[PDB]
């Protein structure tokens, strides 16, 4: 359509800047029914840790609101340190840093990993 | 006003009338842009403050003034000066305006037995040119000023003109 490809074109500048800096990235995907979080290693290739609402401990019915995003954010922080990674860069993937995405980031900061 | 009737008889009857297998491909009216090109007020430009208020009354929604995209000095213009004003209506505001213009005032101007059905584009979007604005209520004849040819445009999810006409065949449109 146009909604998705405008978002992908909106997210380009941040992603290329983080590859220029050669850092670890936290990428966020938001859908109307769920929300996703990944820790891509340094250059877009490998995934070190990930967490979402699709795992068989959060399929309870409300996975598309704020407090659902706060639970997964606390979860991805736990798996990140289990992989021995901190000092990451937050990638909003073209979404606005205002709502479910923003609440996701705060839980990660609270979870321990520092941007 | 008019939403209550759309999905009760228009939606199911056109589902079978056009032999549409699925439900959602039925034509639907998306938005109405009213707008008007103030070709005047080029060297005067002292009617825009009232024209925006004139268009304010018949809508209840604030308009946005347009500007000159290019220069073309032949019409004694360049980019920067306002030339036109537009309004966009959606959801309930557009329907509740439609009935007022559908038939509360539309037959009440001077003449004509209806509206021609040949002013469609290749996809099914309908626009009406109107030579007058005193048609509408909410403005009295004394307080109005130099009259302006306000326009009407309809945008629908129609793939072709006949499907647009078929949807506009309903809603009691003055067609011929």
């Amino acid at each position: 359509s146009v909604k998705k490809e405008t978002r992908l074109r909106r997210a380009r500048k941040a992603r290329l800047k983080m590859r220029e800096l050669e850092t670890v990235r936290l990428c966020v995907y938001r859908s109307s029914q769920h929300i996703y979080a990944q820790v891509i290693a340094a250059d877009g290739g490998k995934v070190l840790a990930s967490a979402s609402t699709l795992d068989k401990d959060l399929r309870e019915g409300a996975t598309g609101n704020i407090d659902a995003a706060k639970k997964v954010g606390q979860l991805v922080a736990e798996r990140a340190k289990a992989a021995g990674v901190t000092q990451v860069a937050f990638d909003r993937s073209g979404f606005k840093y205002h709502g479910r995405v923003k609440a996701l980031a705060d839980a990660a900061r609270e979870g321990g990993l520092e941007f | 006003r008019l939403k209550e009737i759309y999905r009760k008889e228009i939606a199911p009857k056109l589902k079978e009338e056009l032999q549409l297998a699925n439900v959602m491909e039925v034509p639907r009216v998306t938005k109405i842009t009213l707008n008007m090109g103030l070709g005047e007020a080029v060297g005067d430009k002292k009617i825009i403050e009232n024209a925006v208020a004139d268009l304010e009354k018949i809508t209840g929604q604030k308009p946005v003034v347009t500007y000159a995209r290019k220069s073309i000095a032949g019409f004694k213009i360049r980019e920067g000066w306002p030339i036109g004003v537009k309004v966009t209506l959606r959801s309930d505001r557009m329907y509740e305006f439609l009935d007022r213009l559908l038939s509360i005032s539309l037959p009440r101007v001077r003449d004509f037995r209806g509206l021609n059905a040949k002013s469609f584009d290749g996809r099914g979007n309908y626009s009406m040119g109107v030579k007058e604005q005193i048609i509408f209520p909410e403005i009295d004849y004394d307080k109005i000023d130099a009259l302006r040819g306000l326009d009407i445009t309809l945008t629908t999810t129609a793939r072709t003109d006949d499907e647009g006409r078929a949807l506009l065949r309903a809603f009691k449109f003055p067609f011929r």
Binding site: - | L102, S103, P107, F112
Partner: protein, 47 residues
């Protein structure tokens, strides 16, 4: 829906001189009298 820039949008009273009464929202705040309405015109019927 930005507020504090748009006027009151009430339902008014639409009454026709032929006896037709329809309820629809507008920006008049007062009852109106229609000299002609949809149900008192020939062109819809086709005379």
């Amino acid at each position: 829906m930005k507020a504090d820039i748009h006027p009151t949008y009430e339902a008014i009273e639409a009454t026709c001189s032929c006896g037709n009464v329809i309820k629809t929202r507008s920006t008049l705040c007062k009852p109106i009298h229609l000299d002609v309405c949809s149900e008192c015109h020939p062109f819809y019927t086709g005379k």
